[PDB]
């Protein structure tokens, strides 16, 4: 047989997307978490959120987006679910529009702007002493990108509204745009930007979506513990 | 110790640079050649030229040759481990980094595609002729061939201009060196990354058949001497000794 091999950091955002796509497709994959609990400077994984790789026979693929595209285009046995509609399908141009819009969110900026200036976060799951340690980019820049997020989240909420006409974001099937949405939100919850953008009083369809995928078997099996700082 | 793991294609240009740097620094590395003798269409390595390797070192994943080579030079710093780049503050650094960029910017991919297509522009190519034969419309494809040939010529004239500079630099090194004694490499006495880029480039042009155009029979004699000298270098032979022999899988 031909082995499928993945070298990744368990807590890297992009790696989470890749590993969830692997479970959503029911692929056997030999996964190697190369990260270490404590660094040489004695730091745990939630301190070091500063690219994964897939080896499949003769192919080497790098960066999550490229690994996911490789997976979608390569495993086409009928039993293997598709997470993307046919390239000439009516549905592709919409799905790919949200997928690009979600895959474009500055997660790097969010995580760095959560440790710094934690005032903008609410119920952040990162210990408070990271803020002190990391203070040895600016609030102006950070507020902006947070407001941009609202605008993006506004689009998701409005598009999510269409519920009975249960479905997922773009249709009946769980698609690649759902791994981007699911993993994005779970990270925002870790950073403390969840209460700011949904919950009681705000975006009820989005609050229902987030809670629904926490109950999903594949998501739970793959990302159930990634926000638990007690686990290496 | 912490393992060095390398996934690569033996015959890819970028894998060749990385593997040679590993051997020049005398690093232990678990190397995995992912390539297959025969493809799904039952084709050998010399049929299938079109490759980005990855290095796993502890917690680091590094992809692409230049980035892997920059990673090696910067992290492996034991006193017994050779450096292939002079200290950033050396007289020599700007000269080395300047040729390093000049060589690492050559479109090797376009040279190999333009060899499989349009072999009439190659001489004594080592790729079989039968690789080419396999690889309102009438006037559309005619215009593509014309544009691709114009491009291929252009980049081959650029190669010559790169090789003219190398030849002149090797002339400076020959004038500085007594003919009895240890001959320098491109930028000085030490073998540097720019020498691994140059060696692997020249070996590859030889394979594609773009050597006789650029050296031999009086043209670029220092470069010719350089090429023949690096074929005898121990690490080069150990690592690349057989990468141009289509009889070996």
Q: Where are the domains of chain B?
A: 1-84, 85-234
Between chains, do B54 and A60 touch, taking CB under 8 Å as contact? yes
Query: Pick from B9, B58, B61: which is nearest to A51 by CB?
Result: B61
- Annotate A123-151 with DSSP letters as a single string: S-SS-THHHHHHT---HHHHHHHHHHHHH
Whose CA is closest to B56, among B127, B3, B123?
B3
The CA distance from A176 to the nearest CA of chain B, in Å, is 24
* A59 contacts on B by Cβ (under 8 Å): 34
CA B153 – CA A179 distance, rounded (Å): 47
Q: Which of B14, B34, B44 to mutate to test the interface with A (most CBs of A within 10 A)?
A: B34
> Cα(B48)–Cα(B41) distance, rounded to whole angstroms?
10
Q: Which residues does B143 contact at the CB level (< 8 Å), separation at least 6?
A: none
Q: What is the distance between the alpha carbons of residues B113 and B13, in angstroms, rounded to a whole number? A: 13
The Cα–Cα gap between B179 and A117 comes to: 66
CA distance A124 to A115: 9
Task: State whether A62 and B56 contact (CB < 8 Å).
Answer: no
Cα-trace Rg, chain A: 18
CA angle B34, A71, B2 (to 5 degrees): 45
Torsion sign, CA atoms A136, A230, A52, A116: negative
Instruction: Tell me which H or E stretch contains B33.
Output: strand B30-33
* Beta-carbon separation of B63 and A58 below 8 A: no
| Cα separation values, B38 from B44, B46, B248, B249, Å | 5, 10, 12, 9
Phi/psi of residue B240, each to 5°? -115, 10
Torsion of CA B222, B226, B232, B233, to 10 degrees: 150
Q: State which H helix or E strand residue B140 sits in.
A: helix B137-176
Contact in structure between B166 and B198 (CB atoms under 8 Å): yes
CB atoms B54 and A35 under 8 Å: no
Resolution in A: 2.7
Chain A closest-CA separation from residue B57 CA (Å): 9
Judged by CB atoms closer than 8 Å, whether chains meet at A51 and B63 is answered as yes
Q: Experimental method for this entry?
A: X-ray
* Residue B68 contacts residue B75 (beta carbons within 8 Å): no
Interacting residues of A44 by C-beta distance below 8 A, sequence separation 6+: A37, A38, A229, A232
Q: Which of the 8 DSSP states describes residue B47?
A: G
* Helices marked H in chain A: 13-24, 64-74, 92-102, 107-115, 129-134, 139-160, 176-191, 194-197, 204-214, 217-223
Number of residues assigned to chain A: 232
Reported in sequence order, the residue ranges of A35-84 that DSSP labels E, i.e. its strands, are 53-56, 59-62
Give the position of tokens 């040729």. Answer: B99
- Number of A/B CB contacts below 8 angstroms equals 44
Residue owning tokens 């990391």: A134
Q: Is A205 on the interface with B (CB under 8 A)?
A: no
Determine the topology of domain A92-223 in CATH: Glutathione S-transferase Yfyf (Class Pi); Chain A, domain 2 (1.20.1050)
**Side-chain-facing half-sphere of B56: CA atoms under 13 Å:** 24
Which residues from A are below 8 Å from B35, CB to CB? 58
B63 to chain A: which residues are within 8 Å by CB? 51, 53, 60, 62
Quote the CA–CA distance of B50 and B135 in Å, as a whole number.
13
Degrees, nearest 5: CA angle B169-B122-B125: 95
CATH architecture group of domain A4-74: 3-Layer(aba) Sandwich (3.40)
CA nearest to A51 within chain B: B61
Nearest to B52 among A7, A52, A62 (CB): A62
Contacts with A62 from chain B: Cβ below 8 Å: 52, 54, 61, 63-64
In eight-state DSSP terms, residue B30 is: E
The backbone torsions φ and ψ at residue A82, rounded to the nearest 5 degrees and listed phi first, read -95, 140
Buried b (16+ CB within 10 A) or exposed e, A71-108: bbeebeeeeeeebbbeeeeeeeeebbebbeebbebebe
- A15 Cβ partners below 8 Å, 6+ apart? A8, A9, A52, A64
CATH tag, B1-84? 3.40.30.10
Residues A32, A33, A38, A39: what is their CA dihedral angle, to the nearest 10 degrees? 80
As given in the structure block, the two tokens for residue A215 are 């109950």
Q: Give the span between the Cα atoms of A226 and A127, in whole angstroms.
A: 15
Rounded CA-CA distance A35/A45 in Å is 8
Half-sphere exposure (Cβ direction) of A187: Cα atoms closer than 13 Å = 25
Task: Put residue A143 in one of left, alpha, beta given phi > 0 → left and psi -120 to 50 → alpha.
Answer: alpha
**Token digits of residue B44:** 């050998």
Asked if the C-beta of B36 comes within 8 angstroms of chain A's C-beta atoms, the answer is: yes
Q: Are strands A4-8 and A53-56 parallel, antiparallel or unpaired?
A: antiparallel
Report the C-alpha gap between B80 and A226 in whole angstroms. 41
Residue B176 CA: distances (Å) to CA of A50, A193, B167, B198: 48, 66, 14, 21
Q: Please tell me the distance from the alpha carbon of residue A178 to that of residue A214, in angstroms, as a whole number.
A: 12
Q: Are B45 and B20 in contact (CB under 8 A)?
A: no
């Amino acid at each position: 047989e031909v082995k499928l091999i993945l070298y990744h950091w368990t807590h890297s955002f992009s790696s989470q997307k890749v590993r969830l796509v692997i479970a959503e497709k029911a692929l056997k994959c030999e996964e190697h978490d190369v990260s270490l609990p404590l660094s040489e400077h004695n730091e745990p994984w939630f301190m070091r959120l500063n690219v994964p790789v897939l080896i499949h026979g003769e192919n080497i693929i790098c960066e999550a987006t490229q690994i996911i595209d490789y997976l979608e285009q390569t495993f086409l046995d009928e039993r293997t679910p598709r997470l993307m509609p046919d390239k000439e399908s009516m549905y592709y141009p919409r799905v790919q529009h949200y997928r690009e819009l979600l895959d474009s969110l500055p997660m790097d900026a969010y995580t760095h702007g959560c440790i710094l200036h934690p005032e903008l976060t609410v119920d952040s799951m990162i210990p408070a002493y990271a803020t002190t340690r990391i203070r040895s980019d600016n609030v102006k820049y950070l507020k902006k990108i947070l407001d941009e997020l609202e605008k993006v989240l506004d689009q998701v909420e409005t598009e999510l509204q269409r519920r009975n006409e249960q479905p997922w974001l773009c249709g009946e099937s769980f698609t690649l745009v759902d791994v981007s949405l699911a993993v994005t939100l779970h990270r925002l919850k870790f950073l403390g930007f969840a209460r700011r953008n949904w919950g009681n009083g705000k975006r009820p369809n989005l609050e229902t979506y987030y809670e629904r995928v926490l109950k999903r078997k594949t998501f739970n099996k793959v990302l159930g513990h990634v926000n638990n700082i007690l686990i290496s």
